[PDB]
Structure formats: C-alpha cells, structure tokens
C-alpha cells in the first residue's frame, strides 16, 4: 500500500473528469484506463468504466469502495474452469 505521508494516488485526468461529473450533473459512463487510482469519496455514485486490457466494465462506485483502487473491480484474467 502507498505511504500515508504522500497521500492517496489519483490521476489528474481522472480528477478532471470526476469534478466534471459532479458539476454538470451526469449519469454518463466515465471510461478511464486508470486502474491505479484510489477512489475518492466524491466518486461515490459515479458510473465509471475501468479498462481491463480489452474492454471496459461499469463499476458503480458504492460507499464501500473508497479505500480500494479502481483495478480491483475490473478483473483482467477471464477464467472459467479447465473442464
């Protein structure tokens, strides 16, 4: 996990989409390749799409997701079973 003296990590181009989402009032999917971004409490209720190498999957950001990073909710290896 990241240091606490640095603060949590989010990307600027995600931050200039969340504040755009809070202002102009949209339920639009914000598709974002930043899997490494810690969810901020203003991101709660934002339908944001997180890349998983191939496609985007909508992560409806619940309150219970604030500590965790966006890539935990967009799994990249699609596994079903060997038989």
């Amino acid at each position: 996990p990241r240091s606490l003296k640095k603060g949590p990590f989010i990307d600027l181009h995600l931050l200039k989409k969340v504040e755009k989402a809070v202002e102009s009032g949209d339920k639009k999917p914000l598709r974002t390749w930043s899997r490494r971004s810690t969810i901020f409490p203003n991101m709660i209720g934002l339908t944001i799409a997180v890349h998983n190498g191939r496609q985007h999957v909508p992560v409806f950001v619940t309150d219970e997701m604030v500590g965790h990073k966006l890539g935990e909710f967009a799994p990249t290896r699609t596994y079903r079973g060997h038989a």
């Binding site: 619940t62 219970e64 997701m65 965790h68 890539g71 935990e72 909710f73 799994p75 038989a83």
Partner: protein, 116 residues
C-alpha cells in the same frame, strides 16, 4: 482457569496459557501481563482469584474469542459483497495475496483433486 469465554489450561506458564485466547499471541500476551503485575513465568494453577479477575479486564480492553471472529468474518464478507479482486480470490478458493497458483497453492486449494 477461565478467561474471556474459554477455559485456559492450568498447567502451562502464563504467557503460554493465555495464547489459547483467539486474539492474543505472544506479544499481546506479554502486554496483558504487563499491567496485571504478574510475573510471566507462573502457572495458571497457583494464581489468585484477585489476580485472575484483574486479568480479565486486561483482556477486556482488546478484541478476543467471540468478538474477533465476527470482525474478521465481516471483513471477509465485506470483500464478497464488493466483488473486488480480493473478494473473488476468497469466493473461488484461491490465494488472495498474489502467490503462485501454478504449482503448490495447496493451503487454500486443499488436498489434490485429480482429473476425473
């Protein structure tokens, strides 16, 4: 003989017999006995009830046998209902911390399951 819900053994030394509580190991057991004044190399037999009743309030500061199994299970089921990566690792049966699953992930996956 009885601390915090369970029946601690009576022949072991005090920093060893307290370890039976789900919630202390050896470092927190040395911190339980750090404020009860008890020398850490006495047995649970030949103690005092004035010492054992003092000893339970030391254990009552920290989270133990019944109360610790519930915060752990709430934290694991927190990951289940999120459906995060850590939650999928718990509800499939595979190791969560990113270990090897190609060879010898046996502690989560149980014994060997041959091809039918």
């Amino acid at each position: 003989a009885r601390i915090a819900g369970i029946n601690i053994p009576d022949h072991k030394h005090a920093v060893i017999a307290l370890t039976s509580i789900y919630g202390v190991g050896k470092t927190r057991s040395k911190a339980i006995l750090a404020a009860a004044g008890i020398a850490e190399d006495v047995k649970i037999s030949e103690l005092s009830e004035g010492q054992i009743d003092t000893l339970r309030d030391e254990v009552a500061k920290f989270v133990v046998e019944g109360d610790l199994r519930r915060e752990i299970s709430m934290s694991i089921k927190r990951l289940m209902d999120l459906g995060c990566y850590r939650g999928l690792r718990h509800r499939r049966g595979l190791p969560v911390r990113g270990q090897r699953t190609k060879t010898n992930a046996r502690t989560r996956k149980g014994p060997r399951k041959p091809i039918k």
